[PDB]
Amino acid sequence: VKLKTNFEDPKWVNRHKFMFNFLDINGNGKITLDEIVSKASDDICAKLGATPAQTQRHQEAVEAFFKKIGLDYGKEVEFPAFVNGWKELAKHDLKLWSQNKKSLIRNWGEAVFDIFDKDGSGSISLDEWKTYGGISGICPSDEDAEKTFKHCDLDNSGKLDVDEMTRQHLGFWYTLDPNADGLYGNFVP
Numbered sequence: 569v570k571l572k573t574n575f576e577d578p579k580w581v582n583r584h585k586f587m588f589n590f591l592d593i594n595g596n597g598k599i600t601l602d603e604i605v606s607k608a609s610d611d612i613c614a615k616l617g618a619t620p621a622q623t624q625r626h627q628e629a630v631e632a633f634f635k636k637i638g639l640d641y642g643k644e645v646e647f648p649a650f651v652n653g654w655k656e657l658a659k660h661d662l663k664l665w666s667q668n669k670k671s672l673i674r675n676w677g678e679a680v681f682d683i684f685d686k687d688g689s690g691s692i693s694l695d696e697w698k699t700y701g702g703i704s705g706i707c708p709s710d711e712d713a714e715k716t717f718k719h720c721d722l723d724n725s726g727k728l729d730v731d732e733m734t735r736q737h738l739g740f741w742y743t744l745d746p747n748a749d750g751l752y753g754n755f756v757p
């Protein structure tokens with residue numbers, strides 16, 4: 569995993585703008601934590617049939633993750649401030665990860681995978697990633713989900729584990745590590 573960021577690369581700014589536009593479903597150029605948490609709980613966790621405890625751990629993780637970016641309940645955040653907030657989060661999490669500490673991005677990954685994980689493996693299958701991908705919308709075709717798995721280093725079960733997805737996410741969301749390109753197939757640039 570690379571530890572240096574590339575905040576000035578328009579490709580990194582545009583990757584987040586793409587995701588901002590994806591979250592800005594009502595098209596008003598603003599995002600609220602309310603909207604984000606609703607997507608996490610009322611939409612994704614509900615459709616996944618998550619348990620009360622899983623739903624709550626997942627909501628806490630999504631909340632902490634996006635609060636670090638500067639989102640809050642009842643606060644509208646526009647794109648320039650949103651991407652400046654990713655700088656806070658990126659430095660925060662890269663520091664933690666490099667010191668073998670739990671990062672907010674790892675915590676989110678644990679919460680998502682836990683919904684699917686029935687054996688304590690902290691790993692998910694291709695079909696489970698297809699499910700999460702289609703319900704959240706971030707991997708909206710089976711081919712893209714397949715690309716994620718082809719892209720990553722899978723474990724002895726052909727499954728994606730949380731440590732591997734965390735490393736990939738550091739590079740994809742935080743540092744623009746070229747090794748992380750294609751993480752979400754052809755969807756997220």
Ligand SMILES: [Ca+2]
Pocket residue numbers: 591592593594595596597598599600
């Ligand atoms: Ca909006």
